[PDB]
Design an enzyme around this catalytic site. Structure first.
Site, PDB file in Angstrom:
ATOM      1  CE  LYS A 278       0.304   1.579   9.032  1.00 14.07           C
ATOM      2  NZ  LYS A 278      -1.272   1.778   9.865  1.00 14.07           N
TER       3      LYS A 278
ATOM      4  N   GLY B 189       1.169   6.603   4.363  1.00 13.67           N
ATOM      5  CA  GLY B 189       2.458   5.835   4.483  1.00 13.67           C
ATOM      6  C   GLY B 189       2.725   4.710   3.606  1.00 13.67           C
TER       7      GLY B 189
ATOM      8  N   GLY C  66       0.841  -1.124  -0.164  1.00 15.19           N
ATOM      9  CA  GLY C  66       0.034   0.069   0.112  1.00 15.19           C
ATOM     10  C   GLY C  66       0.849   1.318   0.038  1.00 15.19           C
ATOM     11  CB  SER C  67       1.240   4.187  -1.560  1.00 17.82           C
TER      12      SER C  67
ATOM     13  CG  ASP D 260      -8.771   5.340  10.302  1.00 23.64           C
ATOM     14  OD1 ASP D 260      -9.727   5.448   9.418  1.00 23.64           O
ATOM     15  OD2 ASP D 260      -7.781   5.547   9.994  1.00 23.64           O
TER      16      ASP D 260
END
Ligand SMILES: CN(C)Cc1cnn(-c2ccnc3[nH]c(-c4cccc5c4ccn5C)nc23)c1
Length: 267
Positions: A38, A19, A16-17, A123
């Site tokens: 991470k 962070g 992922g992107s 979140d």
């Protein structure tokens, strides 16, 4: 808690992107363990996310392996291979209703434990639920999580930060008050995303238009083919009044009993 950089192997390909998230391998005492890392490349925020995860122990929450201080600050977690639930459902539209019920019920169990432990997630969204297997979900992304003060059942934030408004309860928006009942509201949005096969909530709408729609007593419609009982549960999660909105103990119970009926009815 602190890991040896020599024992961690990072793959160049990024998961992922927010962070960056990289797949890796960590050499344990005998076996090598597959990990999701991470990377920071903000330093106090990563340490606080690690601080939260280290205190949590539940089968439905991502397990932290530890932290690494080398090229960048790294948070090393046990790898959930199938990835985020929203992307999974977008790419696998043939997943049965009993299976989505089973997975959102697993998230409610993980949140029932977070509630009991007096932690607020802040979140909870389908993009932050990771799949271990098609039948096993784990909650992740504790970057905004808070351990509640012993004398209070809510966290009060100071000024609007980087917030996912489409998932936030009205008390979060108007008073900056985050409780486990505000996570129940996000759980309702997450459920809607799950039965909508990973579609984004409030499509084409600005945060301010979402606020206004909710203040008029309007809510997103029933997803195509979503069971009525599940849509009734989302609506109960979207109770405007914090006091009247159910807790995770109540939400989990409804999901548990309904899931046991669906399993029965199937065969
Ligand atoms: C926005 N948050 C979702 C970032 C974040 C935080 N923790 N975390 C992970 C922790 C543990 N196990 C994982 N497994 C995968 C994974 C597997 C396969 C595909 C994936 C991912 C992630 C993106 N993709 C596309 N990510 C993780 C990912």
């Amino acid at each position: 808690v602190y890991l040896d950089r020599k024992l961690l192997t990072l793959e160049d390909k990024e998961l992922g992107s927010f962070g960056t998230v990289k797949k890796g391998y960590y050499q344990m005492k005998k076996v090598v363990k597959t990990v999701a890392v991470k990377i920071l490349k903000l330093k106090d925020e990563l340490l606080a996310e690690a601080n939260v995860m280290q205190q949590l122990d539940n089968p439905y929450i991502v397990r932290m392996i530890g932290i690494c201080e080398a090229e960048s600050w790294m948070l090393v977690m046990e790898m959930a291979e199938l990835g985020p639930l929203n992307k999974y459902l977008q790419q696998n539209r043939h997943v049965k209703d009993k299976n989505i019920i089973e997975l959102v019920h697993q998230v409610s169990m993980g949140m029932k434990y977070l509630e009991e432990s007096n932690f607020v997630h802040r979140d909870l969204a389908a993009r932050n639920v990771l799949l271990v297997t098609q039948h096993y979900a784990k909650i992740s992304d504790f970057g905004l999580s808070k351990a509640l003060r012993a004398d209070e059942n809510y966290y009060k934030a100071q000024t609007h930060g980087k917030w996912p408004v489409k998932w936030y309860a009205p008390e979060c928006i108007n008073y900056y008050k985050f409780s486990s009942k505000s996570d129940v509201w996000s759980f309702g949005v997450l459920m809607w995303e799950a039965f909508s096969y990973g579609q984004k909530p409030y499509r084409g709408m600005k945060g301010s238009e979402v606020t206004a729609m909710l203040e008029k007593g309007e809510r997103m419609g029933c997803p195509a083919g979503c069971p009525r009982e599940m849509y009734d549960l989302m609506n109960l999660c979207w109770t405007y009044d914090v006091e009247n909105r159910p807790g995770f103990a109540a939400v989990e119970l409804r999901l548990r009993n309904y899931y046991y009926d669906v399993v029965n009815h199937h065969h």
